[PDB]
Amino acid sequence: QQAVKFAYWVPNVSGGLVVSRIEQRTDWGIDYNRKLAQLAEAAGFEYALTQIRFTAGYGAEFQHESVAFSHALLAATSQLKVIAAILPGPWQPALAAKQLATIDQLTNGRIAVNIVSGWFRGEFQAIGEHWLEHDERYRRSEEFIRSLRGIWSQDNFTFRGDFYRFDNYSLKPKPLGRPEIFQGGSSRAARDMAARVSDWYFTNGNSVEGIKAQVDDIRAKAAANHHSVKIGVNAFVIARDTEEEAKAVLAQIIDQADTFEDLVQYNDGFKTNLIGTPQQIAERIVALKAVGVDLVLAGFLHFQEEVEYFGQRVLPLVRELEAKAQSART
Amino acid sequence: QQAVKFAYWVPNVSGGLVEQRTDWGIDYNRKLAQLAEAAGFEYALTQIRFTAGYGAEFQHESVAFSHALLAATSQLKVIAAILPGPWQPALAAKQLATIDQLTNGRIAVNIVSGWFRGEFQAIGEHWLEHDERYRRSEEFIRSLRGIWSQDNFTFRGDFYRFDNYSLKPKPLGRPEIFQGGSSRAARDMAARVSDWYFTNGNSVEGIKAQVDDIRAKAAANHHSVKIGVNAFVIARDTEEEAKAVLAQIIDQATFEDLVQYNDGFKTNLIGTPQQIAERIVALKAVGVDLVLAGFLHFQEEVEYFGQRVLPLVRELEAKAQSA
Amino acid sequence: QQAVKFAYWVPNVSGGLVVSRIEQDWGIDYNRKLAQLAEAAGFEYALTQIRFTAGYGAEFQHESVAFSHALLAATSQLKVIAAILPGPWQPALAAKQLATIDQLTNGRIAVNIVSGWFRGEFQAIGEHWLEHDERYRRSEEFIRSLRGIWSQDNFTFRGDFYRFDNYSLKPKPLGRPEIFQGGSSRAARDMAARVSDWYFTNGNSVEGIKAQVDDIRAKAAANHHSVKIGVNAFVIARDTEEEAKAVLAQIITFEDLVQYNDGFKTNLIGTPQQIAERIVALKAVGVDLVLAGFLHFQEEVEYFGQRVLPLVRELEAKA
Amino acid sequence: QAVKFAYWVPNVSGGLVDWGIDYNRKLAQLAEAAGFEYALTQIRFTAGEFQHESVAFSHALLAATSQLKVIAAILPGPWQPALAAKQLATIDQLTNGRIAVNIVSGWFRGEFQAIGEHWLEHDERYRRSEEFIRSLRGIWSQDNFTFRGDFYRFDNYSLKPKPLGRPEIFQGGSSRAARDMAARVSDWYFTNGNSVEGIKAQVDDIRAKAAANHHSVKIGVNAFVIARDTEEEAKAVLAQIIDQANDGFKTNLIGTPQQIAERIVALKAVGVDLVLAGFLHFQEEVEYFGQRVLPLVRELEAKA
């Protein structure tokens, strides 16, 4: 029954929304992102989620390294937390645990981690990494996560895994706080891992009924393991003063595609339907809160403008609706 | 470039050496970096460690710490220590490149081949043979140079593979590659792929022999390498006070045994600022281009160095400028 | 083309046909006599199976390479195809061990490269489970390493899975060990069309096999590579057509049986005359070898060489 | 008990710098009739000219004998324990439990470099070998073996069928890492050839280490045996070897059969349980050993 938390996609990779050639006032540079992070902190966003890439993709020509970029965004803010994306394979838990702990010490305990298991083989092939089977990649990520928790929590951590080994490893200093572990993915392997070792699980964008079904499945598995997991939903937010204007922006995205079902195949956040007036979006967010959603991961076309707009128009309405819901229960 | 460059050991790990007014914390090191920049130091060299013990109970991660020190300075260059094994070149190349973009191209790299097998075993890494570790480090260095300067980089090594890898964005500048080690494998690698080579602390005559050997190997490979020397600087107003500080170090740990832990004492940069300045210029005459300085009390002695020892070095360099 | 060659599944793993509870051994004594009977029956190749952990159909398993050496030592002209599984196997050891056995057996050893089907077997032995197409990339580098080691001195190979640096294997094989390979996926038939000498196609009808043969030969021609084709088949040869159809009924639905053993789809069930006619019919669509599986190996293999195989030779003489 | 005897199988060319199968098949049969119990193969991958693969050669030598035991040489690295355990178990079933294993930690980096293997540090190669040995014992003895090592992992691995017997594990090496590993996991330890006084010191050291681990290990010594009818002829062979240019020479098993038999029993008194014999002409001197030297050793044992 706690307040809904909000996070935004850090555009630390170029291209933005690569499937549409619509003009976007978004940049991947540090100066743009420093201002965006400060705007997001002032707007009421709690988390900033970075993206991890090594090779250029179909539309994303430049990518800042996620961990170094997370440290830079943290140094430009005061209370905003930044989720550093980690890709097992090119990343190893020993370095990831120690680097995230140091950054946590330098930023007053405001760093989190998002473990991505990888979807594109070409990124691994370019950097000399082998391409493991789909479920096998999640076995390795689960050992990666358990290593992070053990290294961060024990004086003499020992782990005898199929992918990672530790023998009386002592990390000092440890994180100031307990870095939260975010994780996405929609496959059975992804939600079996989240139901065991993850703090946050990003469920795929869907309708209110579909998201409720995804929430019930993950909580049922988590309860069987006696594990607690909070749930966030990915959403592409188009907030305008009029419903027609917001629906016109969605039309321009499809019209300048490089159908509506094609956007879902690339970005599931459109199915969340956070498109319309600020009052409509706030009502749908609270409706998602009723089915178990604890966090909204927002994507925007013009990040600096729409994040500021979100904090002045949509977020206050969400808080007012939350107080209204809280007052009716008592 | 003709003037002798100066660098200091960043105390990003606890313990110092075998009472010290130094700290491994960020607040102490931010001030120390700013003091070192104003004192005339050009480089800051971090240390890399993974597990607690082996002398250092507390250890900050070198690359992130390098990013923090760079953000607190304007012209200071920071050398990030990298250890092949727990580190892989693809992540190292991309992380250092982004930090280079965020810090106006002021980051360098020091490739360490590792000394404690217990630290490797604790993190699940196998312990390769001595010369084999330098073969892996050399492939690590070649991958960094290739990734940072060309698109579609391809490398088929025994330790690392790359297949048409294009890193974007690339470093703003060209990160210099520093490297130490005194074994034959260490200086054969430096004479091929390294920009800077740290030679062990020794007498003026011994350092000249080490400089002549490394430059001969580099010339045979058609490779250019600059030379720095490690030194533990104890600068006091009187020679007796400096030798008394050295005595307190030995009595709270012999001199020969002290060298086996830190070779910087053999450089003999102990004494008055005039004595130290003369010995620094004498090393410049045998081919030394940089002095890597270690201190007992970093914040105080760095500031003392920039006000007392460094100006005397510049004056002695200008005296020979007329020739 | 040439005379149709025949091969049989070596039952070096227990269980036999696990899909059926019909009474039907994996010991060395049963297999030494089986190899000699197959050699006298006219079989040219013996195909071993590779397994590492107990379960997944076979509770007891003999090591394929050592078992191949034993069958070769008990015969004179029979060729044995040793099954090799990249992962637990490495090309350097495989190349040297098969070369020594080839020297000791007058060049009668071959190799069948298996890409693995059960991830539980790999996980039990500490091996990582690569993606499906990625496993075939490793198997191809495994095959290229064998060919280079067996044929060249100072071999150098810079692969993503295997490396060789100025390696010279001595002694080399007496002959050129043929490389057999199965698999039906796109990656399996792209690898076979490049580096494999023999390709095992899945059991199917005469029309379906012709389509599979044309596709693989078209890919092989594009690579300027020659590949011979064999087909897996479960042969039930009886004196009467009713008796042969009764054995299939006793084993059994039929569609579920094909999912376990695709050799039943080849439909080599019936009288020796019917089977011999279908074998020559398969030869017309490009089949060069028949991989035969049996319920009672010792009895049916000798029966095959006395009843079915002579008819195949007689039918080939007529045409 | 009775002193056991083994001979170096010349399955690699050069001898003491024939290697063919037909030569070694008859030599194995001659050695079995002469009273030798073990045959020790050598493992090589690269020319140093022609080397037979040790395990396949071991299977061939066993098939040519009835009771002779053959020790197959295994090199961790190019060999992995899962394949080694299963292959030796199958050969054990096919040869009436007459297969043994010699775990070699490797001495030449060029052999590993040619086959794509990394060159680990000296003591690190012995740590991997000890995990290799523990994996062999566990796979051969348990229904569901699990091992979480730094070099090898196993998760509920079930080998069926298991070896008919219990394959003995032989191991040499003289470094501290070599005899610390032998004192824990090895059945037999080959000590370097030396004098009777030096061998006793080596035997006492290894048995002291084995007692601390509560482990039992038998001891063999490498020796190059040159047995001739007269002492002068044996000393002439040694001169011809040196003039036309191996720790086994320090054992000093050179001379008449009576002198060698007396020295063998003296080695038995200091803890030696096996003699690893090297010869100049294998097919000839092995037959001579079994007819002239070995019976005298047995006679000296009966008197004791």
Swiss-Prot record, chain B:
Domain of life: Bacteria
Organism this protein belongs to: Pseudomonas fluorescens (strain Pf0-1)
EC number, as in UniProt: 1.14.14.35
Catalyzed reactions: dimethyl sulfone + FMNH2 + O2 = methanesulfinate + FMN + formaldehyde + H2O + 2 H(+)
GO molecular function: alkanesulfonate monooxygenase activity
One GO term (biological process): alkanesulfonate catabolic process
Protein name, entry field: FMNH(2)-dependent dimethylsulfone monooxygenase
Record keywords: Flavoprotein, FMN, Monooxygenase, Oxidoreductase
Protein family (similarity comment): Belongs to the SsuD family.
Keyword Transmembrane: no
Its biological purpose: Involved in the dimethyl sulfide degradation pathway. Catalyzes the oxidation of dimethylsulfone (DMSO2) to yield methanesulfinate, which is oxidized spontaneously to methanesulfonate in the presence of dioxygen and FMNH(2).
Gene: sfnG
UniProtKB/Swiss-Prot annotation, chain C:
GO MF assignments: alkanesulfonate monooxygenase activity
One Pfam family, short name: Bac_luciferase
InterPro entries: DMSO2_SphG, Luciferase-like_dom, Luciferase-like_sf, SsuD_RutA_monooxygenase
Catalytic activity annotation: dimethyl sulfone + FMNH2 + O2 = methanesulfinate + FMN + formaldehyde + H2O + 2 H(+)
Protein name: FMNH(2)-dependent dimethylsulfone monooxygenase
Transmembrane segments: none
GO annotation (BP), single: alkanesulfonate catabolic process
Keywords of the record: Flavoprotein, FMN, Monooxygenase, Oxidoreductase
EC number: 1.14.14.35
Source organism per UniProt: Pseudomonas fluorescens (strain Pf0-1)
Function: Involved in the dimethyl sulfide degradation pathway. Catalyzes the oxidation of dimethylsulfone (DMSO2) to yield methanesulfinate, which is oxidized spontaneously to methanesulfonate in the presence of dioxygen and FMNH(2).
EC supergroup of this enzyme: oxidoreductase
